[PDB]
Amino acid sequence: MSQYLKPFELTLRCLGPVFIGSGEKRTPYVASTSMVYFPDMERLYADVA
RNA sequence: ACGGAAACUUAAAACCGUGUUGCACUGCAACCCGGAAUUCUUGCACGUCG
C-alpha cells in the first residue's frame, strides 16, 4: 500500500428491512393471497402473429 | 588725269538605305507545432401518521 493510507473494513448486518428511495415506483403487479407475480414485460408481445 | 573704273567664287543635292541586346537556366535541398497538468474535492431520498 502507501504510507499515508491503510485499508479498513466494517460490519453491516441489517435486522430490520432496508429501504432507500430512488424516485422509482411500481404500478398496476398482482396483489393476491399467495403470489406477487413480477413478470417480464418483454414477453407479452410475442403472440402477435 | 593709277592698266585705271565696274563685278558674289555663285546656283542647286538628305550621310542616307538593310539590322530584335537575342538564344541554353526550378528560388531549389534539409527540418513533427513538439514537449510535462485528475474534471476535480463538501453532500444519506428523506422529514410526515388522530
What whole-number distance in Å separates Cα of residue A10 and Cα of residue A20? 20
In the numeric block, which cell numbers belong to residue A42? Answer: 418483454
- Tell me, what amino acid is at A34? S
What whole-number distance in Å separates Cα of residue A36 and Cα of residue A28? 12
Strand B bases with any atom < 7 A from protein Cβ: 44-46
Angstrom distances, CA of residue A16 to CA of A13, A19, A22: 9, 10, 19
Separation of CA A28 and C1' B14 in angstroms?
128
What whole-number distance in Å separates Cα of residue A27 and Cα of residue A41? 13
Q: DSSP secondary-structure letter at A45? A: G
- Decide: A29 and A36 in contact? Cβ < 8 Å: yes
- Decide: A29 and A37 in contact? Cβ < 8 Å: yes
**Closest nucleotide to residue A24 (Cα to C1')?**
B45
User: Resolution to 1 decimal, in Å?
Assistant: 3.7
Give the DSSP letter string of A8-32: -------SS------S---------
